[PDB]
């Protein structure tokens, strides 16, 4: 249908879960990739390799609107997050910038207690 040509995706670089989404240039996110959704579960959903492979699910939605540029965000410090970025560069889609936007509060929210052995 409608071309965008300026790629903008959102990822959720959580530890136990790894999920990227495709977004329109003016917000309005359209389509997404879940590595957990691929059937990978537990350690397999969290694997950096699962995050790297989840590129194909993100790519097919990008291909449908044929978007090229790359302005994507990373929220959460997932293990081997740089390797997932390498996989996006390995894909060869033109890269404009990546944003390390792990949200930091002012301590306003009360944290929950940490788990123990």
């Amino acid at each position: 249908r409608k071309q965008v040509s300026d790629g903008v995706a959102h990822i959720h670089a959580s530890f136990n879960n790894t999920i990227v989404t495709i977004t329109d240039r003016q917000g309005n996110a359209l389509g997404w990739a879940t590595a957990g959704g691929s059937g990978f579960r537990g350690s397999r959903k969290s694997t950096p390799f699962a995050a790297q492979v989840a590129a194909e699910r993100c790519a097919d939605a990008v291909k449908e609107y044929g978007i090229k540029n790359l302005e994507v965000m990373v929220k959460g410090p997932g293990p081997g997050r740089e390797s997932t970025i390498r996989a996006l560069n390995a894909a060869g889609f033109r890269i404009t910038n990546i944003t390390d936007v792990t949200p930091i509060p002012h301590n306003g929210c009360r944290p929950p207690k940490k788990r123990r052995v």
Binding site: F15, P48, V74, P77, G78, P79, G80, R81, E82, S83, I85, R86, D100, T102, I104, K114, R115, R116, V117
Partner: protein, 99 residues
């Protein structure tokens, strides 16, 4: 205790101190830890950390020593972060995550 179980919890703690609490970062990058290898009783922890530094030992070496030089200080940090009597010995390894 059970090492293969405590490993998941420790990796989250190691990442939080690594990203927001640095003032000598030769890496100067979001270096991400692929895995940890704690010994029985957690006496020694092997931290395998990949480097967002172009994956070249030249840039990577700058940080791995930087990872090792500030260990006692960071020891305190993780040492006062999980109520652990065992403060794990800190070791650092560039991972060939990409082959």
């Amino acid at each position: 205790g059970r090492p293969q179980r405590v490993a998941q919890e420790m990796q989250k703690e190691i990442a939080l101190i690594l990203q927001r609490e640095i003032k000598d970062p030769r890496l100067g990058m979001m270096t991400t830890v692929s895995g940890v290898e704690m010994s029985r009783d957690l006496a020694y922890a092997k931290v395998y950390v990949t480097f967002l530094n172009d994956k070249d030992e030249d840039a990577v070496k700058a940080g791995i020593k930087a990872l090792q030089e500030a260990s006692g200080f960071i020891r305190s940090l993780l040492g006062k972060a999980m109520r652990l009597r065992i403060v794990p010995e800190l070791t650092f390894f560039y991972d060939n995550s990409l082959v």
